[PDB]
Amino acid sequence: ALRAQFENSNEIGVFSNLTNSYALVALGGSENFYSVFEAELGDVVPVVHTTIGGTRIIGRLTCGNRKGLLVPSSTTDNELQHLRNSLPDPVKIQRVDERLSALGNIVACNDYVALVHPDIERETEEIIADVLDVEVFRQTVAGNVLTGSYCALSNQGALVHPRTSIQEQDELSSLLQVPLVAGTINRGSDVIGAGLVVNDWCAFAGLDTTATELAVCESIFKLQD
Amino acid sequence: PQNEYIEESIRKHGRRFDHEERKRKKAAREAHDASLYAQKTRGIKAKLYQEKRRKEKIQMKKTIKQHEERNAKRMITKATFVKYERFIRPMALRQKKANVTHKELGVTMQLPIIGVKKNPQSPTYTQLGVLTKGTVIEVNVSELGKYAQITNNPELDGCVNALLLT
Amino acid sequence: RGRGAASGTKYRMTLGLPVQAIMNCADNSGAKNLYIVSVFGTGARLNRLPAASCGDMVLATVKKGKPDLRKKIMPAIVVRQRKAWRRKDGVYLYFEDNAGVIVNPKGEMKGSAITGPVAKECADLWPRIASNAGTVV
Amino acid sequence: HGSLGFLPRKRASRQRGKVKAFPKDDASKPVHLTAFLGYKAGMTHIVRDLDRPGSKMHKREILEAVTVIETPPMVVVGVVGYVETPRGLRSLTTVWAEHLSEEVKRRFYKNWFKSKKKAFTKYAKKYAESTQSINRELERIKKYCSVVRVLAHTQIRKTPLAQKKAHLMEIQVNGGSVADKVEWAREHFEKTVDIKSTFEQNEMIDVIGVTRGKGNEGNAGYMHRTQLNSKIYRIGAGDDAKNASTDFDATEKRITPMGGFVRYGVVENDFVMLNGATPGPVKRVLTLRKSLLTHTSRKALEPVSLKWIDTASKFGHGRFQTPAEAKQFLGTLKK
Amino acid sequence: TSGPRDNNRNKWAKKHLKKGKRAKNSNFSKFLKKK
Amino acid sequence: AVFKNITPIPDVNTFLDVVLSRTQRKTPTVIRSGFKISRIRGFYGRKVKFTQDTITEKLDSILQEFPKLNDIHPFHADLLNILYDRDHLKIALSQLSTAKHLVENVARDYIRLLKYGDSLYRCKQLKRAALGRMATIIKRQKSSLEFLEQVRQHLSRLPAIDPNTRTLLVCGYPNVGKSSFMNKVTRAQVDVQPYAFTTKSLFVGHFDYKYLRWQVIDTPGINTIEMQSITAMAHLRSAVLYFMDLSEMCGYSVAAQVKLYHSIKPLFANKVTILVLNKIDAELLQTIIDDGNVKVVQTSCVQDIGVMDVRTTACEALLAARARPACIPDSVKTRRAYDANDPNRRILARDIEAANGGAGVYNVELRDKYILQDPSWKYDRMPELLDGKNVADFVDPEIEAKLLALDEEEERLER
Amino acid sequence: SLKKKSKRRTTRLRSRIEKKAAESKRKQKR
Amino acid sequence: HFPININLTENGTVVEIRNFLGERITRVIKCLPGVTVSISSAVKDEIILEGNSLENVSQSAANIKQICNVRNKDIRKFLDGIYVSERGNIE
RNA sequence: AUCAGAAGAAAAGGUGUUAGUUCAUCUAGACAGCAGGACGGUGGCCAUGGAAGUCGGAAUCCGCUAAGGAGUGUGUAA
RNA sequence: GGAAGUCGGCAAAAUGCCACUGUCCCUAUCUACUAUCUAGCGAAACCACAGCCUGGGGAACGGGCCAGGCAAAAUCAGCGGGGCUUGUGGCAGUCAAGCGGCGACAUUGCUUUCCUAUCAUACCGAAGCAGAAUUCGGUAAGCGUUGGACCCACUAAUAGGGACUACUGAUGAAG
RNA sequence: AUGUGGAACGGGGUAUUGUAAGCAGCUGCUGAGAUUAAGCCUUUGUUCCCAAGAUUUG
């Protein structure tokens, strides 16, 4: 795992997005943030220096996996054209004309399973299955609808609220077919999606995350090999 | 950092490179700096330096003198103590204790004012207990009933400084 | 506590909510109303009532709410605005109702899910609100 | 309150903004002009990509209000030399051309119609028959004079106005030596100097004008002012049907909005697109000069790439840029 | 706040005027000057 | 308990000069005889009131910033009695408070009398009589202010010992290898010299082990230094790590060290003792080992071995007392981690920055990384608009064939 | 002037300087 | 901690100072006329100022020293800078 | 005199200047400037983690003398 | 936005704690009339003589005096302007520079514009000032010193004080 | 003081409003109709006017 911060903010889940096929980072601000992502994934996956809707919070405004990427209807044609030019062919890009524009705060997805804010429209569910090629479950985490921000999820693990009950963790893990952990981040910051960005081989966390959590993410996401 | 950390730093890394030169030159030029300070400054800061230089001059004269010796409205407008009370006697002007200094003993003793003997200003002041200069007052001297004379002005000083008549 | 942990910097925009104004509670923290008592970062402009805007922090009192959140004046982030404000893009925006969220001075909001649209400005500045936002336009 | 640097608040004793300061002359630089003279046609707004690093909208689209002023190429019609003296600059001599057009001759009379049109007859006559006097005077300028300022007059005929008296002013000539300035001045008699050869679409100029007269509120308005740091966005040519077409727009169009500029007319000459406001109302002559000083603030150095320029109808609420597009959208009218 | 009347603001302003920052103004006028 | 936040004390003369200078500068100065008596009274009362506020404001700052010995953790409380004689400190702190009321009473008195001032002079002398008294009141605490400044000066030097966190207190005879262990464990640099009593006072140092932070507080050997060590061991949740000079290279008899450890055993009660055999590479030991709490860990002080093992043993004792196929790319399995030294690390955008002008100047070429058939067009501008219509809506890789499949059709309509 | 005050003593000062000098001399005589 | 980087131009009449105390301000000085600045190899990281006029050499030595003064720190601990070591002659 | 000049603060201060008054050494070399010595009982005695003249309390003595003060300061844990 | 203005629901608005309101933030626009100009008609109060400013003239210092600053016709419309004093108390004894018994310090006894005397911003010197934060002091009045009932927040800070002619615009004869 | 002269209308463009009467079976003629410079742009459109009077000027 890595400790990195955007500007002087620990919430690097907001300011960037990362999947098994690409990496999206904010623009015009700290290119040191681009350097951090490039230092670990520069020669493996493309690192796109992009923006969504003229904002630096692209991480919470998009949702994607190794196969497809989604953007809200608020994104410009120019920014969408930029993303498709930079991104390679095997990754599909789509505009999701959907109820709650912030896709990152409502949808957390991997290559095989996605968790969505129940309050999404049926056509959105259909296109997510069509694009992401994952099974869609309209469930909730810790009683909170914002699955994407409170459930940092990857191919080899997942993290949720420490508050959620043990039976709830077991239900989510069994329905996700992946080990799950109820942990914390950034010294009591319960927005796990907004603090931790994870792929199947690397993970980044805020600078304010202590060593105890970093060991926990290392164990659950098994980056040691 | 722990305890005398700068002392440790001085020990393990040394002081500034030119530190001795700077302090020696500062120790060299204050004689010129003092005269420049004495001739150019004006006002209170000047006056304070004026009196403090006399302090050091007199001191240095004495320590050197010791050296060859070694080598060799109807109201009361004054302080009061407690019809006849026609005027108003404020509780503010009321006085109860006095600083009476014995003549032979030479110690200023805090003694309560038993009463006022006689006011040289006028009999009305003595009747009203108006404390003034030269007025005789009797106080208890059990811890030392004796008379005394006021050596101060309670109206201005605000403290009843008196000398025992003994 | 003003301008604190707000990531970058905020472009100038029209002032919508002066002192002693009522806004809806936007999150599900349990509050209904907020009352502006003071505005952070106001200079010595004579006879100028401090005013709030999207992405701004104001000392707020929960006028209507459960008594535990009441009786303690604390900062709040104005998340929406009714007065028309122009983006640097040029388009002019305005919402139906003045809304605000309940936030600690550090920047972490006290709610769990905010209701309705979110100003794109405040989502840019405040990553914590962007962490807990539903839809931003 | 009110600034004390702008009093006595009284009506400007001039209509064309006086350039009270010219850039410092440096002989290391060779010769160029230092000012120009245009007419405020009006303003529109644009969309631009913003390449300012660290700005919150780096590489993002903004919208900017731009002032369009039409500048038909000025005509140089004389040369003047100022000599340094302990009592200040003093105009030593003046030399003119032969063919001074009727536009500038009108400047010398309050009644051009009733006059006998007798300006510059003897001078032009002696100019042709004996050029030794002109040579002697230019010899004097290159021998004594230290500041060389050329008379240039604007071709108000091309402007869509009703005025006919051309405007006349003194552009200083910075660069080279005094001999180089006089040679440059003599080689441009009776010729025209175009704004494309004076400003280059990206520099940061200072705009001088007289404010719009608001009336009596003491006197308010109609004051001489000097905007500094006004940045050129686009120097367009009046001959091209692409002067309002960007690289992101195509759409063959002209800078003049739908229906002509309000209270000005149709701009069919070389024009300048400055940013933001400029002093004075429309159809008032503005003066443009190079900045007196070098300031390389990042705003003064960064390049500009206009994405789209607006030619809607400023006379109301326009919603169609070009008449072709209006016909395509609107159904075929009964006409 | 350091005021624009500061001699050190003016001093560093000078050194900016002696980089390529002003070079893009020296030959920048040479553009028109060959026309 | 960070004692560094205490403002520095003036030395009386400065205290009066600062107070008197403030009164002259912040309050009015000019008055004439012809002014109304109310204005004359109001003027001088303002100075008398103002100086009292200045004196009290300074005095309260001392009284609040200093730590209240009763309300603090008895570790630091017991540390301060040995260093600062709590009675002397309490007497000093109390005297300033008695001073604080005394200035208030004199100020109230002379303001009260001044209401009856009849001429400019009589108010002038009460003001002088005032300013003299609060000046003379303060001058009597010369010893108290000097004592507090010395106490302040040494308080700011003390290390903020951590009582809540897990700790490993180290104690023993002087020069018994404790300094070497502290240097090897804690990043702090404590001077180690053959001179005895080098550890003048407690030295605190934080260490990280088992994903947790432990505070090692070295104590002076064994008296004021011995009393500090005893008090530190008295109230501190920590494991005893006494180091015994087995080789007797420390200059003290092994029996003497055993006797000292037995004497300190009363303080070491209810703690995880450690029987460190210092200078192992370089009788009563069986009696000490019979206790069982102390763990016999050999420590090669001369050979500089076993320090890490001792720390690991101590930490362990303290802890006891308290389908989803992740297709990682093949390049990831052989990726060289970016470390700046080696040139191997591919350049980064951070490095392209510093060569090209730094932050705020370098314009990142956003178009510089499009996967595209050509890197020349890599800066081209794509049309966005034309004739009321967006270019974007028409971009189709096969659109040319839709245009030809057309050409037949219009040719049909014209015919 | 060039000073912080006026060197020309106004006739009040020319008036009362001499008499207060006279009172000073009388004080020494007493 | 931070090495002081020195660059010599115009046969050593202008000195460029970099990385002083981690600062990225380029402390540049022009030596007074008749003063030449060189970097000696026999002793590491020390400078030799040669000239004919003592006033100009000494003032140039003073100018360099006052350019690199520590600021807002302690003379007690941050005792970093350039100091004049020896004051002699060519032969 | 970086704001000189053409009885009230007033008494005091000034490495400003010029004259005097009263004392001092001086080609047995004056003052300063330099080279060198500036000692040995003794780290005298209580005092202490460590105090050696210089954290601290009384003397504070003696051999050589042309001179070395149980010490004038800096300083060292010493 | 809806009492933050104001001692305040003064006056409108809402109808014939909630709610409304330009009282305020912060004013903007629109209409009529007065207003200005033109043709006509056409007063009175008041009037020693007059009308630039700084300082001084014993007072009362002034519009005349003195010393200066200065000073170019005729007008039009607004605005009404007209050697004090400070930062350091009182009693008693002890010295003792010295003078002629006092005796100096010290010691012991008890109880709009302006000013800088700068709150903030600029710089500076000192402090056990590691960093940060801060304290004291110096130069410094260029520039700011807020919004609500001693308070309670904001803020970099919410420092202490003095007090006919002119003014503002508009024409204008003339070397 | 006779010309890419000036004016009065008119046409076109741009605009504001929101589809005029009447006819025919709410619908269609009807983005119609009206207003458009009074501080909008333009005019080969039609007509007229001007190649003057007074005063002051070395």
Q: Which chains touch G (3 or more CB pairs under 8 A)?
A: none
Measured in angstroms, the CA of A12 and the nearest CA of chain D are apart by 18
The helices-and-strands tally (H runs, E runs) of chain C is 2, 11
* Angle CA B53–B63–F146, to nearest 5: 70
Separation of alpha carbons D39 and D18, rounded Å: 15
Neighbours of A32 (CB within 10 A): 16
Nucleotides of I under 7 A from a protein CB: 2-3, 5-8, 10-16, 49-50, 76-77
Q: How far apart are CA H12 and CA H37, in angstroms?
A: 5
Please name the residue that has the structure tokens 């308005």: D221
Q: What is the DSSP string of D257-287?
A: -TTSBTTTB---S-EEEEES--SS-TT-EEE
Binding residue per annotation — F110?
no
List residues bridging with C82 in a β-sheet: none
Residue with tokens 């109301």: D316
Residue A62 C-alpha from the chain's centroid: 8
- In one-letter notation, the amino acid at residue A85 is N
Instruction: Give the whole-angstrom CA distance, residue A11 versus residue A149.
Output: 11
The structure was resolved experimentally with cryo-EM
Residue type for position C8:
G
Neighbours of C129 (CB within 10 A): 30
The residue extents of the domains of chain A are: 1-225
- Residue by residue, what is the 3-state secondary structure of G1-30? CCCCCCCCCCHHHHHHHHHHHHHHHHHHHC
Widest CA span of chain E, in angstroms? 45
F278 annotated binding-site participant: yes
Q: Given strand H27-30, what is the order of strands in its sheet?
A: H5-9, H14-18, H27-30
Give the Cα separation of D70 and D158 in Å (integer): 10
| Structure tokens that stand for F263 in this block | 């004497």
Flag if B8 and F191 touch (Cβ within 8 Å): yes
Looking at the DSSP bridge assignments, the partners of residue D75 are D153, D192
Name the residue type at position F181.
Answer: F
Chain B partners (3+ C-beta pairs within 8 A): F, H
CA-angle at E26, arms to E20 and E29, nearest 5°: 135
Residue A90: cis peptide before it, omega within 30 degrees of 0: no
- Closest alpha carbon to C1' of K52, residue: D114
Query: Who's near C67: CB < 8 A, 6+ residues apart?
Result: none
Give the span between the Cα atoms of A41 and A220, in whole angstroms.
21
Question: What is the total count of domains within chain C?
Answer: 1
Among C2, A185, D54, which Cα is nearest to F363's?
D54
Contact H75 B18 (CB under 8 A): no
C-alpha dihedral, F248 to F252 to F256 to F260, nearest 10°: -110
Enumerate the H helices of E1-35 as residue ranges. Answer: 7-16, 20-33
Provide the 3-class DSSP secondary structure of residue D93. Answer: strand
Element (H, E) at A71: strand A68-72
Place of tokens 């009563």: F284
Contact A78 D61 (CB under 8 A): yes
Residue D157, classed as helix, strand or coil, is coil
Pairwise CA distance, residues F129 & F106, whole Å: 10
| Four-point Cα dihedral A205, A209, A210, A213, nearest 10 | -60
Task: Tell me how far apart the alpha carbons of residues A46 and F346 are, in angstroms, rounded to a whole number.
Answer: 14
What would the two tokens of residue B73 be? 């409205």
* Surface of A (25-84) touching F: CB under 8 A: 27-28, 31-32, 34-35, 38-40, 42-49, 66, 77-78, 81-82
**Other C-beta atoms lying within 10 Å of the C-beta of residue F169:** 23
Instruction: Identify the structural domains of chain F with CATH numbers, from first to last.
Output: 13-157 (1.20.120.1190), 167-321 (3.40.50.300)
Closest by Cα among H71, H82, H88, H90 to H29:
H82
Identify whether the C-beta of residue D311 lies closer than 8 Å to the C-beta of residue D255.
yes
For residues E19 and D299, the answer to whether their CB atoms sit within 8 Å is no
Residue F110's alpha-carbon distances to B90, B151, B159, D274, F101, in angstroms, are 14, 20, 11, 72, 14
Query: Domain range for residue C67?
Result: 1-137
Closest-CA residue of B relative to H86 is B18
> Cα–Cα distances in Å, from F298 out to D254, F142, F258, F291?
93, 55, 16, 17
F379 touches chain D (CB under 8 A): no
Strand J, nucleotides < 7 Å from a protein CB: these are 1-4, 18, 24-26, 55-59, 83-93, 97, 104-106, 109-113, 117-119, 121-124, 126-132, 134-138, 142, 144-148, 153-162, 168-171
- How large is the C-alpha radius of gyration of chain B? 29
In the chain, the amino acid numbered F144 is: S
* C-alpha dist (Å) from residue C101 to A57, C5, C109, C115: 19, 16, 7, 10
**How many beta carbons lie within 10 A of that of residue D230, not counting itself?**
19
Judge contact between C60 and C82, C-beta under 8 A.
Answer: no
**Residue F383 to residue D251, Cβ atoms within 8 A:** no
Q: Is B158 within 8 Å of F129 when comparing Cβ atoms?
A: yes
Backbone angles phi, psi at D56, to 5 degrees: -65, -25
Cβ count near D282 (within 10 Å): 18
Asked if residue F39 keeps its beta carbon closer than 7 A to nucleic acid strand J, the reply is: no
In contact, D260 and D227? CB cutoff 8 Å: no
**List of chain D residues whose C-beta atoms are within 8 Å of the C-beta of residue A76:** 61
Tell me the two tokens of residue A102: 């912030």
H84 touches chain B (CB under 8 A): yes
The counts of H helices and E strands in chain A are 9, 15
- How far is F204 from F168, CA to CA, in rounded Å? 10
Cβ(F302)–Cβ(F279) under 8 Å? yes
Q: Does H81 touch chain B (CB under 8 A)?
A: yes
* List of chain D residues whose C-beta atoms are within 8 Å of the C-beta of residue F383: 247-250
Q: Which nucleotide is closest to B33, CA to C1'?
A: I15
Beta strands in A138-176 (DSSP E): 152-153, 158-160
Is strand J within 7 Å of residue F36 (CB)? no
Q: Report which DSSP code applies to C27.
A: B
- Asked if the C-beta of B45 comes within 8 angstroms of chain H's C-beta atoms, the answer is no
Residue A23 host element (H or E): strand A23-25
Lookup: tokens for F286? 């069986």
Residue with token string 């690199």 = H68
Contact, A74 vs A102, CB < 8 A?
A: no
For residue C118 the two structure tokens come to 């979110």
Resolution (A): 3.2
Spacing of C-alpha F288 from chain mean position: 39
Residue D324 dihedral angles phi and psi, to the nearest 5°: -60, -45
F279-297: burial string, b at 16+ Cβ within 10 Å, e else: bbeeebbeebeeeebbbeb
- Tokens encoding D304: 């500009």
Tokens 């000019």 map to which residue? F30
Rounded Cα distance between F393 and B12, Å, is 73
Which amino acid does the sequence have at B10?
I
Contact partners, residue F116, CB within 8 Å, separation at least 6: B77, B90, B92, B93
Contact C101, C125 (CB under 8 A): no
Residue F238 bridge partners (DSSP): F167
What does each C-alpha distance from H13 to D139, H20, H25, H38, H74 come to in angstroms?
Answer: 45, 20, 20, 9, 32
Distance set, CA F128 to CA B131, B158, B160, F56, F269 (Å) = 21, 11, 17, 19, 64
Torsion of CA A173, A178, A180, A185, to 10 degrees: -130
Exposure class string for D34-51: b at 16+ Cβ within 10 A, else e: bbbbbbbbbbbebbbbbb
Which amino acid type is present at position F57? E
Written as six digits, the tokens of B93 are 């002007």
CA of F5 to C1' of J133 (A): 9
Q: What's phi and psi for D280, nearest 5 deg?
A: 85, 160
3-state secondary structure of A128: helix
Of the partner residues D30, D31, D301, the one whose CB lies closest to the CB of residue E24:
D301
Q: How far, in Å, is the CA of F9 from the C1' of nucleotide I52?
A: 36
Q: How many CA atoms lie within 13 A of F207 on its CB side?
A: 26
CB-side neighbour CA atoms (13 Å) of H59:
11
Strands (E), chain C: 17-18, 22-25, 33-39, 51-52, 56-61, 74-78, 85-86, 92-93, 99-102, 117-118, 135-136
Contact assignment for C134 to A105 by CB distance below 8 Å: yes
Tell whether A61 is within 8 A of chain C (Cβ): yes
Count of CB atoms within 10 A of residue C82's CB?
Answer: 14
The nucleotide closest to G20 (CA, C1' atoms): I7
Distance from CA of D325 to the nearest CA of F (A): 6
The pair of three-digit structure tokens given for residue D305, joined into one six-digit string: 């790439």
What residues of chain C have any CB closer than 8 angstroms to a CB in chain D?
8-9, 11, 88-90, 124
Is D133 within 8 Å of D126 (Cβ atoms)?
yes
Q: Which of the nucleotides in strand K have any atom less than 7 Å away from a protein CB atom?
A: 1-2, 4, 6, 13-16, 29-33, 37, 39-42
Chains G and D touch, contact meaning at least 3 pairs of CB atoms under 8 angstroms apart: no
Contacts of F234 by beta carbon, 8 Å cutoff, 6+ apart: F78, F267
Query: How far: D329 CA to K21 C1' (Å)?
Result: 30
* Helical packing angle, F86-114 and F37-65, nearest 10°: 170
DSSP letter at F141?
T
For residue B106, count other CB atoms closer than 10 A to its CB. Answer: 7
Query: What residue in B sits closest to F159 (Cα-Cα)?
Result: B2
CB of A76 less than 8 A from some CB of D: yes
Residue H41 backbone phi and psi in degrees, to 5: -95, -25
CA distance A67 to A134: 10
- Tokens read off for A85: 């030019």
Amino acid at H65: K
Structure tokens at H63: 């100018």
Q: Is F177 annotated as a binding residue?
A: yes
Nearest CA to D306 out of D65, D10, D22, D53 is that of D65
The answer to whether C80 and C95 are in contact (CB under 8 A) is yes
Nearest chain B Cα distance for residue F152, angstroms: 12
Please report the DSSP string for F41-100 in residue order.
HHHHHHHHHHHHHHHHHHHHHHHHHS--GGGS-HHHHHHHHHHH-HHHHHHHHHHHHHHH
Q: Which residues in chain H are contacts of B19 at CB distance < 8 A?
A: 75, 79
Query: Could you say which DSSP state residue C31 is in?
Result: B
F174 annotated among ligand-binding-site residues:
yes
Q: In what order do the strands lie in the sheet with F274-278?
A: F243-245, F274-278, F295-299
Classify residue D332 by its DSSP letter. Answer: P
The amino acid at G3: K
Q: Which of D48, D60, D248 to mutate to test the interface with A (most CBs of A within 10 A)?
A: D60
Q: Distance (Å, rounded) from C-alpha A116 to C-alpha A127?
A: 13
Task: Determine the 3-state secondary structure of F17 from DSSP.
Answer: helix
Q: Angle, to 10 degrees, between the axis of helix F74-84 and the axis of helix F224-234? A: 170
Structure letter (DSSP) for residue D61: E
D58 touches chain A (CB under 8 A): yes
